[PDB]
Nucleic acid binder design. Structure first.
Ligand SMILES: OC[C@H]1O[C@@](CO)(O[C@H]2O[C@H](CO)[C@@H](O)[C@H](O)[C@H]2O)[C@@H](O)[C@@H]1O
Length: 229
RNA sequence: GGGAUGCGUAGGAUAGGUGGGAGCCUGUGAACCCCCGCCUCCGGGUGGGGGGGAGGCGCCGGUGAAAUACCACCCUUCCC
């Protein structure tokens, strides 16, 4: 009946809204802000000094988190020839060709990432572009999700190679681990995401790039942080 | 500083963006009834209050370009 439940209201008292925390402080506090009945994902949020309306100020990139995402990633790989066996033995959850394209086309969605070899991307683009596109699941050499080293790509994605892309309002968000992680490992992951983010600052972007940065848990409150700590 | 606002069509119906998400809320009072302010696309929405006394919400499915609880950073148009 209030705006929040007693669980959440108990967490809110544990943060200081006026304080900008160091990354090390946030990394250590995060265990206290995670009281859901599952292992909560830790998230980093940044309000960016860009104009999201212009293409040359988009922020899009990937980063390999030093200590991963802390969760299984079901990877569907679309390949042909010897690469099918490569994808299989590299541990992709699903490996198919023409027929798996068909299956996705009819609304099968039970996977977390899609990767593909180049020599199948023609078909994947035309047929699946419409259905994976507006969900960001379409494989693409930009995101490291397309290549003939399909084995290596599957292992990199299982190891928590994330993509990040600002939203139309000028904010950006990413998962960076689990609240059960050791704090130093969380800190490593946070700093790595911030590092990758800053490396994608647009040349013509005006003013401070990271206008604000926050760390939070899946169902908990947030703490504002100093990205340069 | 504080508080509102977000509805083509289809779809429970009022779906602003993205990210997180498989759980969330509830005798620390669910459903439901009633009163008031605000907002309204006139469907309802939202905030508070008076009662009530045990169940709600999400997920899956379905519709859809997008799916919904809960949580985070934001944006639009406004008010005190
Ligand atoms: O998106 C697939 C993956 O995400 C989860 C939550 O982590 O489900 C989310 O995405 C679904 C696909 O649209 C939504 O329907 C669902 O409501 C949302 O939580 C997982 O359940 C799923 O494996």
């Amino acid at each position: 009946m209030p705006k929040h439940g007693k669980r959440y209201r108990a967490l809110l008292e544990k943060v200081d809204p006026n304080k900008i925390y160091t990354i090390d402080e946030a990394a250590h506090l995060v265990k206290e802000l995670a009281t859901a009945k599952f292992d909560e994902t830790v998230e980093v949020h940044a309000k960016l000094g860009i104009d999201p309306r212009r293409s040359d100020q988009n922020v899009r990139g990937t980063v390999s988190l030093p200590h991963g995402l802390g969760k299984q990633v079901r990877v569907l790989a679309i390949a042909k020839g010897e690469k099918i066996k490569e994808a299989e033995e590299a541990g992709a959850d699903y490996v198919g060709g023409e027929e798996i394209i068909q299956k996705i086309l009819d609304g099968w969605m039970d996977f977390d990432a899609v990767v593909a070899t180049p020599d199948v991307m023609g078909a994947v683009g035309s047929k699946l572009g419409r259905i994976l596109g507006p969900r960001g699941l379409l494989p693409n050499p930009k995101a490291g999700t397309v290549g003939f080293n399909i084995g290596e790509i599957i292992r990199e994605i299982k190891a928590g190679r994330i993509e990040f892309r600002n939203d139309k309002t000028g904010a950006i968000h990413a998962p960076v681990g689990k609240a059960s992680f050791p704090p130093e490992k969380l800190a490593d992951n946070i700093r790595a995401f911030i590092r990758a983010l800053e490396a994608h600052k647009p040349e013509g972007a005006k003013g401070t790039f990271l206008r604000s940065v926050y760390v939070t848990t899946t169902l908990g409150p947030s703490v504002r942080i100093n990205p340069h700590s």
